[PDB]
Design a protein around this nucleic acid. Structure first.
Ligand SMILES: [Zn+2]
Ligand SMILES: [Zn+2]
Ligand SMILES: [Zn+2]
Ligand SMILES: [Zn+2]
Lengths: 73, 73
DNA sequence: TTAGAACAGTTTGTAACA
DNA sequence: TTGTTACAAACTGTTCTA
Protein backbone atom coordinates (compact mmCIF):
# COMPACT_ATOMS: atom_id res chain seq x y z
CA UNK A 1 0.00 0.00 0.00
CA UNK A 2 1.60 3.24 -1.22
CA UNK A 3 0.80 5.95 1.29
CA UNK A 4 1.32 9.67 1.77
CA UNK A 5 3.64 10.03 4.75
CA UNK A 6 1.87 13.30 5.63
CA UNK A 7 -1.89 12.64 5.57
CA UNK A 8 -2.38 8.89 4.99
CA UNK A 9 -4.18 9.03 1.66
CA UNK A 10 -2.81 6.86 -1.13
CA UNK A 11 0.54 8.24 -2.21
CA UNK A 12 0.90 8.94 -5.93
CA UNK A 13 4.70 8.72 -5.88
CA UNK A 14 7.90 10.14 -4.44
CA UNK A 15 7.41 13.91 -4.59
CA UNK A 16 9.95 16.47 -3.35
CA UNK A 17 11.90 13.63 -1.76
CA UNK A 18 9.02 11.90 0.04
CA UNK A 19 6.18 9.46 -0.56
CA UNK A 20 3.12 11.72 -0.77
CA UNK A 21 -0.30 12.00 -2.33
CA UNK A 22 -0.92 14.53 -5.07
CA UNK A 23 -2.72 16.83 -2.64
CA UNK A 24 0.26 17.06 -0.30
CA UNK A 25 2.94 17.52 -3.00
CA UNK A 26 1.09 20.58 -4.36
CA UNK A 27 0.37 21.93 -0.88
CA UNK A 28 4.10 21.71 -0.12
CA UNK A 29 5.10 23.64 -3.24
CA UNK A 30 2.45 26.27 -2.52
CA UNK A 31 3.33 26.57 1.17
CA UNK A 32 7.14 26.37 1.09
CA UNK A 33 7.18 28.97 -1.70
CA UNK A 34 4.31 31.22 -0.59
CA UNK A 35 4.47 34.43 1.45
CA UNK A 36 1.59 33.21 3.70
CA UNK A 37 2.87 32.60 7.24
CA UNK A 38 0.86 29.74 8.76
CA UNK A 39 0.16 30.03 12.50
CA UNK A 40 -1.33 27.06 14.32
CA UNK A 41 -4.48 27.69 16.39
CA UNK A 42 -3.33 25.17 19.00
CA UNK A 43 0.01 23.59 19.77
CA UNK A 44 1.89 22.99 16.50
CA UNK A 45 0.94 19.31 16.82
CA UNK A 46 -2.42 18.90 15.05
CA UNK A 47 -3.25 15.50 13.60
CA UNK A 48 -2.88 15.44 9.81
CA UNK A 49 -5.18 12.81 8.30
CA UNK A 50 -6.84 12.66 4.90
CA UNK A 51 -10.13 14.09 6.25
CA UNK A 52 -8.64 17.08 8.10
CA UNK A 53 -5.38 17.89 6.27
CA UNK A 54 -6.85 21.27 5.24
CA UNK A 55 -7.48 22.28 8.86
CA UNK A 56 -3.96 23.34 9.89
CA UNK A 57 -1.61 24.50 7.11
CA UNK A 58 1.14 25.13 9.68
CA UNK A 59 1.13 21.57 11.05
CA UNK A 60 0.78 20.09 7.56
CA UNK A 61 3.85 21.97 6.29
CA UNK A 62 5.72 20.96 9.45
CA UNK A 63 4.94 17.29 8.84
CA UNK A 64 6.09 17.71 5.23
CA UNK A 65 9.48 19.00 6.39
CA UNK A 66 9.80 16.27 9.03
CA UNK A 67 9.04 13.69 6.33
CA UNK A 68 12.13 14.91 4.46
CA UNK A 69 10.33 17.00 1.84
CA UNK A 70 12.50 19.55 0.08
CA UNK A 71 12.52 21.89 -2.91
CA UNK A 72 15.58 20.12 -4.33
CA UNK A 73 18.65 22.29 -3.70
CA UNK B 1 -17.06 48.11 19.11
CA UNK B 2 -19.33 45.60 17.33
CA UNK B 3 -16.98 42.60 17.40
CA UNK B 4 -17.95 39.00 16.70
CA UNK B 5 -18.20 36.86 19.83
CA UNK B 6 -16.86 33.80 17.99
CA UNK B 7 -13.93 35.09 15.91
CA UNK B 8 -13.49 38.76 16.85
CA UNK B 9 -14.14 40.20 13.39
CA UNK B 10 -16.37 43.24 12.98
CA UNK B 11 -19.83 41.98 13.90
CA UNK B 12 -22.54 42.59 11.30
CA UNK B 13 -25.42 42.21 13.75
CA UNK B 14 -27.18 39.80 16.08
CA UNK B 15 -27.39 36.57 14.05
CA UNK B 16 -29.03 33.38 15.36
CA UNK B 17 -29.07 34.80 18.89
CA UNK B 18 -25.56 36.23 19.23
CA UNK B 19 -23.38 39.12 18.06
CA UNK B 20 -21.46 37.69 15.09
CA UNK B 21 -19.92 38.70 11.80
CA UNK B 22 -21.41 37.61 8.49
CA UNK B 23 -18.84 34.83 8.23
CA UNK B 24 -19.81 33.14 11.51
CA UNK B 25 -23.53 33.57 10.89
CA UNK B 26 -23.41 31.61 7.69
CA UNK B 27 -20.92 29.08 9.07
CA UNK B 28 -23.34 28.31 11.91
CA UNK B 29 -26.34 27.71 9.65
CA UNK B 30 -24.27 25.49 7.34
CA UNK B 31 -22.67 23.54 10.20
CA UNK B 32 -25.62 23.23 12.60
CA UNK B 33 -27.90 21.93 9.83
CA UNK B 34 -25.22 20.08 7.88
CA UNK B 35 -24.63 16.34 8.05
CA UNK B 36 -20.85 16.66 8.45
CA UNK B 37 -19.52 15.68 11.87
CA UNK B 38 -16.53 17.89 12.68
CA UNK B 39 -13.71 16.37 14.74
CA UNK B 40 -10.99 18.59 16.18
CA UNK B 41 -7.50 17.49 15.15
CA UNK B 42 -6.10 18.83 18.44
CA UNK B 43 -7.60 19.16 21.94
CA UNK B 44 -10.95 20.90 21.27
CA UNK B 45 -9.41 24.20 22.44
CA UNK B 46 -8.36 25.85 19.18
CA UNK B 47 -8.06 29.63 19.04
CA UNK B 48 -10.81 31.08 16.84
CA UNK B 49 -9.83 34.48 15.44
CA UNK B 50 -10.50 36.18 12.11
CA UNK B 51 -7.16 34.89 10.77
CA UNK B 52 -7.61 31.20 11.68
CA UNK B 53 -11.38 30.79 12.09
CA UNK B 54 -11.64 28.39 9.13
CA UNK B 55 -9.02 26.04 10.59
CA UNK B 56 -11.17 24.06 13.06
CA UNK B 57 -14.91 23.91 12.27
CA UNK B 58 -15.44 21.82 15.41
CA UNK B 59 -13.99 24.42 17.79
CA UNK B 60 -15.73 27.17 15.80
CA UNK B 61 -19.12 25.45 16.05
CA UNK B 62 -18.45 24.77 19.73
CA UNK B 63 -17.77 28.46 20.38
CA UNK B 64 -21.01 29.27 18.55
CA UNK B 65 -23.03 27.13 20.97
CA UNK B 66 -21.14 28.52 23.99
CA UNK B 67 -22.23 31.96 22.70
CA UNK B 68 -25.95 31.16 22.70
CA UNK B 69 -26.45 30.70 18.96
CA UNK B 70 -29.51 28.73 17.85
CA UNK B 71 -31.82 28.00 14.94
CA UNK B 72 -35.25 29.53 15.48
CA UNK B 73 -36.88 30.48 18.78
C1' DT C 1 -33.40 45.53 11.59
C1' DT C 2 -32.21 39.88 10.12
C1' DA C 3 -32.88 35.08 7.82
C1' DG C 4 -32.13 33.11 3.99
C1' DA C 5 -30.55 32.26 -0.59
C1' DA C 6 -27.13 33.55 -4.57
C1' DC C 7 -23.08 35.28 -6.05
C1' DA C 8 -18.17 35.74 -5.81
C1' DG C 9 -13.88 35.13 -4.43
C1' DT C 10 -10.54 31.84 -1.88
C1' DT C 11 -8.73 27.61 -1.35
C1' DT C 12 -7.75 22.90 -2.15
C1' DG C 13 -7.26 19.00 -5.08
C1' DT C 14 -6.88 16.43 -9.88
C1' DA C 15 -5.21 15.65 -14.20
C1' DA C 16 -2.29 16.67 -17.85
C1' DC C 17 2.11 18.58 -20.10
C1' DA C 18 7.12 18.11 -20.54
C1' DT D 1 8.79 8.18 -13.60
C1' DT D 2 8.05 13.25 -11.44
C1' DG D 3 7.72 18.60 -11.27
C1' DT D 4 4.94 22.46 -12.97
C1' DT D 5 0.86 24.07 -14.18
C1' DA D 6 -3.48 24.49 -15.72
C1' DC D 7 -8.36 22.79 -14.96
C1' DA D 8 -11.82 21.62 -11.69
C1' DA D 9 -14.12 21.18 -7.85
C1' DA D 10 -14.71 22.51 -2.58
C1' DC D 11 -15.06 25.74 0.33
C1' DT D 12 -15.55 30.11 2.85
C1' DG D 13 -17.23 34.66 2.74
C1' DT D 14 -20.19 38.87 0.54
C1' DT D 15 -23.95 40.81 -1.34
C1' DC D 16 -28.38 40.66 -1.99
C1' DT D 17 -33.44 39.40 -1.66
C1' DA D 18 -37.49 38.77 1.66
ZN1 LIG E 1 -1.24 13.54 1.61
ZN1 LIG F 1 -1.71 22.94 14.07
ZN1 LIG G 1 -17.05 35.82 13.40
ZN1 LIG H 1 -10.08 22.47 17.38
Amino acid sequence: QKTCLICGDEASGAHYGALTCGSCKVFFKRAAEGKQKYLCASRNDCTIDKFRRKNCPSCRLRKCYEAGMTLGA
